Write a protein that binds this DNA or RNA. Structure first.
Ligand SMILES: Nc1ccn([C@@H]2O[C@H](COP(=O)(O)CP(=O)(O)OP(=O)(O)O)[C@@H](O)[C@H]2O)c(=O)n1
Ligand SMILES: [Mn+2]
Ligand SMILES: [Mn+2]
Length: 347
DNA sequence: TCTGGGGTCCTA
DNA sequence: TAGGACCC
């Protein structure tokens, strides 16, 4: 009768996992990131607890910046293995409900629920909250709509430890005067381009002439922005396993690199680590991309397609160093990265 | 106490 | 192939 999309998102996920092994820190500023040493430059916070966010600290903020704003915080090192496991357990529980479940991120998933005319999608959401709490001790919030984009927007209102329903009835009323980058899939660049067209809010964008948007953004993107402004989005929740298109590793060096020999051997290392992981996953490499960023934060990526797909390490390393070779080391290097694109056609 | 790391996909 | 743009 009525299809609902429920977006379930774990609250302050990494901090919550940390709070499981350190319950005395509940209600205190806890900042996860780096090796838990707040003075290291070139590292960021990966999760701030809600109490640390009152001091302005947020994921993405450098650790040194977070130490300046919240001197009393307990800084904890990032524990990805713990976070990976705590996510695996949460999602396994979420599928156990029997609904389509689509996992996005370590801390989120969408769940499809066709419900009729009783009952209430909120009670599904309440049971989801009660289940994950009693089995995992972790708190989630749940945004409810009929499509993924709108449900995800609804979750931002549901936080923390809550539930929120956002549909055609209350879309525009809720969303109308908000800036266009509150829409999932619109960010600061599209926002500035819209502001140069006289469009500063979701309501403005939802009534904008399609041709103005398709001329400026593309015949498909212009229409999509209109759809998203009117509250629409992807409605189907797929339970099929995700098959990654690429795998990559980048590294920002604690001190800018001046020696070619160090650059080659970092590229070689990144290539060989990434290749070893994708081979573990039974994948084959199609393209090799190498990223260079300079001390002035100037970032370019070059990519080369291999003659045929392969997992040959000598071929992949040489590919990576040839692609690196087309750059200039005119300036010192802040970061190098390798990304390996992967064959999709088979598993 | 400048500016992380992991990804996807439109379009030129 | 480049790279702009957005997301978690
Ligand atoms: N730039 C970023 C942005 C996000 N992340 C990571 O992805 C998770 C996204 O959270 P989520 O934004 O979907 C919210 P979360 O931070 O758990 O707290 P909330 O529940 O109150 O929103 C973050 O906590 C970060 O670890 C990152 O590594 N780099
Ligand atoms: Mn979260
Ligand atoms: Mn999330």
């Amino acid at each position: 009768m009525t299809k609902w999309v429920l977006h379930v998102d774990l609250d302050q996920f990494y901090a919550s996992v940390e709070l499981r092994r350190r319950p005395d820190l509940r209600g205190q500023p806890v900042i996860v990131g780096g090796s838990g040493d707040p003075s290291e430059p070139r590292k960021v916070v990966t999760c701030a607890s809600y109490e640390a966010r009152e001091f302005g600290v947020h994921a993405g903020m450098p650790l040194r910046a977070a130490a300046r704003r919240c001197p009393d915080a307990t800084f904890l090192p990032s524990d990805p293995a713990a976070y990976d496991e705590a996510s695996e357990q949460v999602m396994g529980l979420l599928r156990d409900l029997g609904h389509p479940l689509e996992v996005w991120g370590w801390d989120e998933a969408y769940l499809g629920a066709d419900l009729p005319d009783e009952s209430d999608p909120v009670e599904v959401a309440e049971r989801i909250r009660t289940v994950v709490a009693a089995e995992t001790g972790l708190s989630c919030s749940v945004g409810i709509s009929d499509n993924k984009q709108r449900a995800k927007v609804a979750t931002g209102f549901a936080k923390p430890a809550g539930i929120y329903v956002l549909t055609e009835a209350n879309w525009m009323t809720v969303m109308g005067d908000r800036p266009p980058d509150a829409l999932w899939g619109v960010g600061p660049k599209t926002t500035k381009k819209l502001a140069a067209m006289g469009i500063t809010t979701v309501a403005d964008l939802a009534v904008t002439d399609p041709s103005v948007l398709t001329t400026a953004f593309g015949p498909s993107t212009g229409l999509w922005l209109l759809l998203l402004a009117k509250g629409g989005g992807d409605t189907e929740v797929s339970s099929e396993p995700w098959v990654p298109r690429s795998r990559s590793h980048v590294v920002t060096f604690p001190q800018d690199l001046t020696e070619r020999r160090e650059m080659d051997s970092a590229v070689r290392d990144l290539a060989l680590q990434t290749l070893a992981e994708i081979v573990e996953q039974g994948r084959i490499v199609t393209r090799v991309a190498v990223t260079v960023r300079t001390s002035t934060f100037y970032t370019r990526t070059k990519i080369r397609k291999l003659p045929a797909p392969s997992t040959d390490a000598g071929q992949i390393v040489d590919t990576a160093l040839a692609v690196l070779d087309q750059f200039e080391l005119d300036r010192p290097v802040r970061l190098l990265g390798v990304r390996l694109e992967l064959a999709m056609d088979d598993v």
